[PDB]
Amino acid sequence: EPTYTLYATFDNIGGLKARSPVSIGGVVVGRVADITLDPKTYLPRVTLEIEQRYNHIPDTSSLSIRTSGLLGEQYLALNVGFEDTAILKDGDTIQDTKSAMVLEDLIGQFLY
Amino acid sequence: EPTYTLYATFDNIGGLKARSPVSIGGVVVGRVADITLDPKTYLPRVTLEIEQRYNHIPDTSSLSIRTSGLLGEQYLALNVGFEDPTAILKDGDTIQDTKSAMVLEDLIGQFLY
Amino acid sequence: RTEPTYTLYATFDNIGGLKARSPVSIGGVVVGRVADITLDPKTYLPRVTLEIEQRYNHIPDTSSLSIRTSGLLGEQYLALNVGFEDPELGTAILKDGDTIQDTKSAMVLEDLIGQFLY
Amino acid sequence: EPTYTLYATFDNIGGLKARSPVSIGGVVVGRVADITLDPKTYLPRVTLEIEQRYNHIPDTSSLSIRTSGLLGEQYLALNVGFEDTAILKDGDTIQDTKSAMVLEDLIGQFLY
Amino acid sequence: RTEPTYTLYATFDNIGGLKARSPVSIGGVVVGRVADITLDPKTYLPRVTLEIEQRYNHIPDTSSLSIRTSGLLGEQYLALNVGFEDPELGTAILKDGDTIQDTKSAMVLEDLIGQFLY
Amino acid sequence: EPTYTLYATFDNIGGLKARSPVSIGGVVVGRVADITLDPKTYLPRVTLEIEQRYNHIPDTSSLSIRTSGLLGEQYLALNVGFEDPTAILKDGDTIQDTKSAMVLEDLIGQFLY
């Protein structure tokens, strides 16, 4: 499958790494190609490669970083948004992101 | 065993994959043959193969995606529904009634917020 | 050589992870083995066949089976709970080919989570 | 080390098996030698072998069945009772026992 | 060849499972490595030496370190949190040999359990 | 490193064994050399060997038995106490202040009852 490039910035990518999958409905449609840290914002930017056969994904789509079972690996959940506006293609950015949970933040929540 | 085909659409199939089992009462009656994503709806469509000897399963039946123990693998729980004046499923029929895999992050967000 | 056994049957709603050769415990002591599991072609209910060591012959009908797990990531097993022997009436002893009417099906991790939350 | 025999009856021995240790203060002083089910009571009877160098253990002592960490193995916690009456030796019984927890009873407690 | 780095130091109360070669993450992206851990012969406090890739040169003094775990049975790592750059005053940039004053020590499983209960 | 001897008595040492470490601030400063059970008190007495380079540890110091992560192994957390007009520990000294291993069954019994 040829792929098209997508970019996304998160506050915290956590356990996500190069080769991590991109799922829709839990089906893998692509892969984290590279992770790097903005020289200026010190915020991580993910580069995605999405199989071409999933070409009709809207800009209103989002990404969440998630885990696969309890001790699972980290993956990216692409949530397909409503169409009315455009469609993503090599070089487009996903605006709407949700950062990995931080186990220590949940323990501090769950206690305090 | 020869098998008969069934189809079912979920919002989220999570860890379910090709060759994942189909259980009834925890007894394996079949296998996920293929998972693919609807070209139009971007919703996963599961193709099931059920051993023929389990032919009298009604339309009011459901599937849930479940895990086998805590760190288990994902499987499909077919719940045989009550039969009443609908029909019986056979090669090519669809199961309307589905329940998508749980998402660890949604349960933690529930349990906290 | 091997301990000779007697056959017992039970029907559950859901046997979960239980399989052929799974043990049968009393007070956590193994007294036998799941011999076969099969799914009724008509009731779509699993029927378990048990082999119990002969030396445990005085088990009453009022006895139960629960499907349980051995620790958190454990294997599945059958807990046979010995019921009380009533001298009033109602209360015999199980022998080759008897059925255990009182069963409890495997717990379903998804049902516990759905309970615990909703 | 030569050993002396001790016996004990529990309602439920759970995951305890032949060769399981007998700890005092978390120090191993002996071993489950055999487990068997009373022909009449259908209650498990444990046979223990205790290293001889621990000879001054009173009758008022108890046994609890416990687990070593979360996914640990099962062991027997011998709790040394007060002396005023006697001392255990080859063939004596420990009256005071506490049966293994049953994971399904704790889940039913924790929910209902 | 290898990315050249700059040295940073930090003192914690308790470094827990953190060891030499443990990573340093920003937003979960690795920017460096624990180079050495040693215990002050006088303060009996652990002092960590860090090597940060040069290409991350614009980190402010108001930045912090927390010792964290990667999933539940994970390995220990250092979360460097980039602080705000104040144009009023008080707020420089770290260079070879600077110290990170703001630290948070490893969590102690026994302290969480003692909290959660008592 | 040459080492200096220390002794300490706990109610329950749990999973702690010979060769278990002694940490300060999570830095290993020594090893459990031997565990044995007092012939009289039936209480476990731990013999510790501490690297000599950590000689200035006060009597008001404590030991706790702890676990390294959830499924971790057991180790001894030496907490250096505040020094005030007592003394310093050296080959043969005893640590009064101890905390015995947690017992999973006691925490579950707390958490429920």
Swiss-Prot record, chains B, F:
Keywords: Cell inner membrane, Cell membrane, Membrane, Signal-anchor, Transmembrane, Transmembrane helix, Transport. GO terms for cellular component: membrane; phospholipid-translocating ATPase complex; plasma membrane. It is a single-pass type II membrane protein. GO terms for biological process: intermembrane phospholipid transfer; phospholipid transport. GO terms for molecular function: phospholipid binding; phospholipid transfer activity. Disruption phenotype: Mutation leads to accumulation of phospholipid in the outer leaflet of the outer membrane and increased outer membrane permeability. It confers sensitivity to SDS-EDTA. It comes from the Bacteria. Its main location: membrane. It is found in: Cell inner membrane. Forms hexameric rings with a central hydrophobic pore via its periplasmic domain, which also binds phospholipids. Contains at least four binding sites. Part of the ABC transporter complex MlaFEDB, which is involved in a phospholipid transport pathway that maintains lipid asymmetry in the outer membrane by retrograde trafficking of phospholipids from the outer membrane to the inner membrane. MlaD functions in substrate binding with strong affinity for phospholipids and modulates ATP hydrolytic activity of the complex. The complex is composed of two ATP-binding proteins (MlaF), two transmembrane proteins (MlaE), two cytoplasmic solute-binding proteins (MlaB) and six periplasmic solute-binding proteins (MlaD). Interacts with MlaC. Belongs to the MlaD family. This is Intermembrane phospholipid transport system binding protein MlaD. The chain holds residues 37 to 152 of 183 of the full protein.
